[PDB]
Design a protein around this ligand. Structure first.
Ligand SMILES: O=C(N[C@@H](Cc1cc(I)c(Oc2cc(I)c(O)c(I)c2)c(I)c1)C(=O)O)c1ccc2c(c1)C1(OC2=O)c2ccc(O)cc2Oc2cc(O)ccc21
Ligand SMILES: [Ca+2]
Ligand SMILES: [Ca+2]
Ligand SMILES: [Ca+2]
Ligand SMILES: [Ca+2]
Ligand SMILES: [Ca+2]
Ligand SMILES: [Ca+2]
Ligand SMILES: [Ca+2]
Lengths: 34, 337
């Protein structure tokens, strides 16, 4: 099966279905940053 | 309808791109719906060019969607997002902290209370430090403890504060087994630098695709009800190009192309936080008269007695084996006009 490894910079969206709203949007460059 | 959904998503991406310029090669995290909702609330009390600038900055064309339809749409959006759904915590609401000497219009207040999930608090801004603490504690409470210290500084002549808050907590449709999580796995933060993160791992059927035009992998992870996360993983060296392409059109394309199939998936467990001073950004984007001595908020107070002075946002995210918790809040500050 294909491997997807989220181990470098990625964008993230959190969506609500019924309204098609983007609740949150971001880019994770360094997941350990203060 | 879904005319509004396309517009709000494109606003989110345009604002995102502004942040990629303001804070280049840094974590970004915000709630576009929180920012949009707060500004549209402010626009309810605005008139003429003050009002039109706000909704045009939010992405709306007043020929396509008349002011009253926009107002209606956003009222319906907030209602729908708050409608109780089993296994999903999602609340979005507003609070208006109004100076005790302001003369707000009954119409502005009764409307936001009844139609826009707004609590109204008469506030003594003669004690600015106490007011700042009250507002911060209210936001902290409404975000289940997650957004702390929203307001770092409050102008001494503040006479009104508008806040929007959002809190989201959901479980993955397919949670991760913590016994399969690697304690310390490499995550590339630049070409020659890795950090160590816990890396969750499961093999499951997920909706996914490789976008052949934009050279990125897209992975959808459902929450158990009414919500989903999308992870967008550009090919090495392609983040900027993917950021340029993000739009409502791109989301519509992916919605068609996503197919469910087996994936051996590795996802980090992590938390991040971000804050934004938005005053100058919103000015640059087209909200001008709201800040001026000729601001027209004649729908808000009897004497049109205020103008916008500052704006800020804070948002936080945690992702782990069970699901996701995220929260955000938007702050708009007003002073005597
Ligand atoms: O293909 C499906 N997609 C899901 C997940 C999803 C992807 C994306 I990208 C979203 O962002 C988005 C999409 C559009 I179009 C616009 O304009 C914007 I702005 C942003 C979103 I929000 C969600 C989806 O729900 O659309 C899919 C997978 C699985 C299932 C369906 C669809 C669905 O029933 C499923 O089991 C379903 C479920 C809930 C809905 O509200 C709608 C649909 O659509 C649908 C239609 C048909 O014919 C069969 C099944 C389903
Ligand atoms: Ca909640
Ligand atoms: Ca006062
Ligand atoms: Ca009155
Ligand atoms: Ca109170
Ligand atoms: Ca690596
Ligand atoms: Ca399985
Ligand atoms: Ca007047």
């Amino acid at each position: 099966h294909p491997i997807i490894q989220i181990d470098r910079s990625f964008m993230l969206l959190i969506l609500e279905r019924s309204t098609r709203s983007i609740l949150f949007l971001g880019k994770v460059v360094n997941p350990t940053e203060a | 309808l879904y005319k509004m959904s396309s517009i709000n998503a494109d606003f989110a991406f345009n604002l995102y791109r502004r942040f990629t310029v303001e804070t280049p090669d840094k974590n970004i995290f915000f709630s576009p719906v929180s920012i949009s909702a707060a500004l549209v609330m402010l626009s309810f009390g605005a008139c003429c060019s003050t009002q039109t600038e706000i909704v045009e900055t939010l992405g709306f064309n007043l020929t396509d969607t008349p002011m009253v339809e926009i107002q209606h749409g956003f009222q319906h959006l907030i209602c729908s997002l708050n409608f109780p759904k089993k296994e999903l915590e999602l609340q979005i609401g507003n609070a208006l902290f109004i100076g005790k000497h302001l003369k707000p219009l009954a119409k502005f207040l009764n409307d936001v209370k009844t139609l826009y999930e707004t609590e109204v608090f008469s506030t003594d801004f003669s004690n600015i430090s106490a007011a700042k603490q009250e507002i911060n504690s209210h936001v902290e409470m409404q975000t289940k403890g997650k957004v702390v210290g929203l307001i770092q500084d409050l102008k001494p002549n503040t006479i009104m504060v508008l806040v929007n808050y959002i809190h989201f907590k959901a479980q993955w449709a397919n949670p991760f087994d913590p016994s399969k999580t690697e304690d310390s796995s490499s995550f590339l933060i630049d070409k020659t630098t890795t950090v160590q993160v816990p890396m969750m791992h499961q093999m499951d059927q997920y909706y996914h695709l490789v976008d052949m035009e934009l050279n990125c992998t897209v992975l959808q992870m459902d929450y158990s009800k009414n919500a989903l996360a999308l992870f967008v993983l550009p090919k090495e060296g392609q983040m900027e190009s993917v950021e340029a392409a993000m739009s409502s059109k791109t989301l519509k394309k992916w919605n068609r192309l996503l197919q469910k199939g087996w994936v051996d998936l590795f996802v980090p467990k992590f938390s991040i936080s971000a804050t934004y001073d938005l005053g100058a950004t919103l000015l640059k984007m087209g909200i001008q008269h709201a800040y001026s001595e000729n601001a027209d908020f004649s729908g808000l107070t009897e004497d049109n007695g205020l103008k916008l002075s500052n704006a800020a946002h804070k948002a936080v995210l945690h992702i782990g084996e069970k699901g996701t918790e995220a929260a955000g809040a938007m702050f708009l500050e007003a002073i005597p006009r």
